[PDB]
Amino acid sequence: NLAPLPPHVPEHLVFDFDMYNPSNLSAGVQEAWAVLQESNVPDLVWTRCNGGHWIATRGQLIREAYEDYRHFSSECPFIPREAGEAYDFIPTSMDPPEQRQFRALANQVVGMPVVDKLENRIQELACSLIESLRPQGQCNFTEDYAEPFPIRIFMLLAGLPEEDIPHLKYLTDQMTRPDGSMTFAEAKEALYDYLIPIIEQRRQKPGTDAISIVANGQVNGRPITSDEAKRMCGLLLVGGLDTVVNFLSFSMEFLAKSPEHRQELIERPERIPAACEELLRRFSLVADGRILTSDYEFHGVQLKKGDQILLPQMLSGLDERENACPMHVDFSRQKVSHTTFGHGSHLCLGQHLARREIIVTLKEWLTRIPDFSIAPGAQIQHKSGIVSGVQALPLVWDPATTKAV
Ligand code: HEM
Ligand SMILES: CC1(C)[C@@H]2CC[C@@]1(C)C(=O)C2
Ligand SMILES: [K+]
């Protein structure tokens, strides 16, 4: 249903896009969002779906809004309004200047030096999963690799038992793509209920895992509070359980459907990092936003204090004003423009971990299983939300064409 149009919002800017169930979803989720960049769609539209909110449709406006934290605050960064209001993860719910001391701490548990320390385990897990799959000649990619690989790495980093994954994964998914059994506030409450006693335990007896490091950390030289540590750990959990997991499935679906692209990476392994970047542009998948701190005129549109604005990270790289032939995957693309990992002061802290997971996946998979396709008959379905994803990805191949390492 459609929220009544607010008096201040011009009728000619109304485009009722539903970010949790977009009209054109069956053509693929990026395609469905890309309808916002068809001719005759303004740079900034209002949807009456999900309580009503603005959507910036072009990378120029998305970037500008992300840079301007004084007008576009991350205090309420999710749609619908109930979810954005409840949302209190650190650092994402804070604006500069107060945000920064918290980023620095988070960077200590997911930053480059940590990723370098994880490198061998990341490599081993990829190899163990793929080798185990190789003789079978099929898999359900979402459950058999896309989920266990990045998630087990995160649980290792966090010192959390893998048997807790089903519960934590369910809760994280309700925050990004709710099935309707839980509001965002209920899912958050449950994530914090899980975390509170582990945070307390690890402040009493500090270990070397990421929760211990955050919960015993300092921010600008003063001790972090129990409550702050919980709000940061919760975010780390969502990042670990619902980002790369989804991205790997878009990429693998594409590689399954495109022998010529796999062939390029098989003949030319050195291109994998570039291919990773071009897939991160084409299969970009996050869309969150900001709240207006004051009435503000932005690109000839009057925004009112309290208005929410969706600033889809997904859209910048798909905009033909940033990338010619944006729906085409070109691993040789010269200037790969995107905001897949966000933009401005909230630039993704997990991006080095993400790219390492993606590049290790591509290298290891294409080495052992160069030739695969979608299961015959399978109608691949995407799902949309704050993070988009793939419902199921059944793959098949002939074991005879695979290679043991
Ligand atoms: C394909 C993988 C990933 C994508 C596309 C992604 C995307 C994003 C985006 C767009 C933001 C900014 C959101 C905003 O400005 O409101 C962000 C922030 C963040 N990401 Fe990622 N991310 C990914 C992987 C990860 C992983 C694996 C982790 C950690 C386990 C993580 C940790 C974080 C954290 C802690 C922030 C908040 C930084 C801040 O608010 O200052 N990310 N990410
Ligand atoms: C938008 C995000 C991808 C970013 C990290 C996890 C996520 C869902 C957030 O709450 C901030
Ligand atoms: K909030």
UniProtKB/Swiss-Prot annotation:
Its EC number is 1.14.15.1. The keyword 4Fe-4S does not apply. It is found in: Cytoplasm. Keywords: Cytoplasm, Heme, Iron, Metal-binding, Monooxygenase, Oxidoreductase. It catalyses: 2 reduced [2Fe-2S]-[putidaredoxin] + (1R,4R)-camphor + O2 + 2 H(+) = (1R,4R,5R)-5-hydroxycamphor + 2 oxidized [2Fe-2S]-[putidaredoxin] + H2O. GO terms for molecular function: camphor 5-monooxygenase activity; heme binding; iron ion binding. One of its GO terms (biological process) is (+)-camphor catabolic process. The keyword Transmembrane does not apply. Its cofactor is heme. It comes from the Bacteria. Transmembrane segments: none annotated. One of its GO terms (cellular component) is cytoplasm. Pathway: Terpene metabolism; (R)-camphor degradation. PROSITE patterns: CYTOCHROME_P450. It is an enzyme of class 1 (oxidoreductase). This is Camphor 5-monooxygenase.
